[PDB]
């Protein structure tokens with residue numbers, strides 16, 4: 403891989419998110435150790451690991467749940483043994499128990515407390531990357547930037563030097579990074595951020611269906627992926643920052659495969675600012691018809707998109 407980090411999301415611990423705490427093996431699962439080794443064998447050195455804020459910290463501002471922390475640490479052992487980095491993805495959409503950050507129910511400081519606690523646990527783990535928040539939305543770009551700043555500050559106060567992946571609002575879409583239609587863009591709002599540890603990257607997501615939601619197995623053209631990364635890529639370069647494509651996916655059809663090749667090629671060509679990417683998704687709990695799975699079959703076989711991903715890994 404010409405990029406520093408390439409890999410996949412191992413989805414499952416964030417499943418059935420209505421259920422709190424939920425029960426391990428019933429409502430959610432952590433990955434199998436063999437998942438880590440399978441992806442390592444395909445050249446992937448990075449695993450993004452979604453998990454829920456509510457499951458790791460069952461009361462705001464309170465202690466971490468030790469069983470949940472143990473599950474995360476067990477995944478970290480597997481990643482380390484397979485020479486992989488582990489992105490801790492707080493997979494929460496800027497919400498806690500369905501209430502948005504910035505409401506009276508969930509002050510921005512609560513997110514900083516969560517990350518203070520995780521940083522204290524993982525500050526001495528070089529393999530660990532802090533994915534502050536999956537797809538904030540329903541919060542303005544400046545208000546999210548303030549919440550992100552508080553979180554970065556909290557992490558650095560612990561002495562942690564780990565890479566922090568910082569999203570924007572608007573589901574952190576690459577395509578909409580610079581949009582001012584509805585007010586302040588992510589581009590403008592996030593220029594304010596300061597990381598005293600100088601080890602930050604901006605996390606964007608990009609899907610290729612009509613509304614960039616990844617809800618349909620369509621890529622609207624054979625070039626749309628690279629097209630939608632251009633504005634964000636330029637913003638990174640303009641601001642001397644780095645980026646990370648925390649989620650992206652394409653379905654198994656010719657137009658999508660061309661788009662996939664194009665976007666992977668584009669990131670390699672622009673490796674001065676792209677640190678890497680993690681495909682959405684693998685994990686053992688996707689249904690047979692899920693269009694974006696790269697979890698190997700029970701028969702051991704590779705999924706179709708993996709033949710392309712592996713060429714860039």
Ligand SMILES: OC[C@H]1O[C@@H](O[C@H]2[C@H](O)[C@@H](O)[C@H](O[C@H]3[C@H](O)[C@@H](O)[C@@H](O)O[C@@H]3CO)O[C@@H]2CO)[C@H](O)[C@@H](O)[C@@H]1O
Nearest residue numbers: 537572573575578583607608609612613614615616617
């Ligand atoms: O990106 C994955 C994420 O998608 C969420 O859907 C979002 C899309 O990300 C977002 O692009 C779309 O934005 C639209 C905007 O709200 C409209 O007002 C108008 O400007 O068009 C935009 C699309 O070009 O909004 C949808 C939500 O409606 C999924 O909800 C989420 O599950 C998923 O992870």
Ligand SMILES: OC[C@H]1O[C@@H](O[C@H]2[C@H](O)[C@@H](O)[C@H](O)O[C@@H]2CO)[C@H](O)[C@@H](O)[C@@H]1O
Nearest residue numbers: 413414416417418419452616617682689
């Ligand atoms: O419907 C199956 C399964 O979906 C889980 O949510 C998925 C969702 O289907 C997918 O579109 C999105 O990209 O990822 C999420 C997982 O983060 C859901 O959590 C389960 O309750 C449900 O059984």
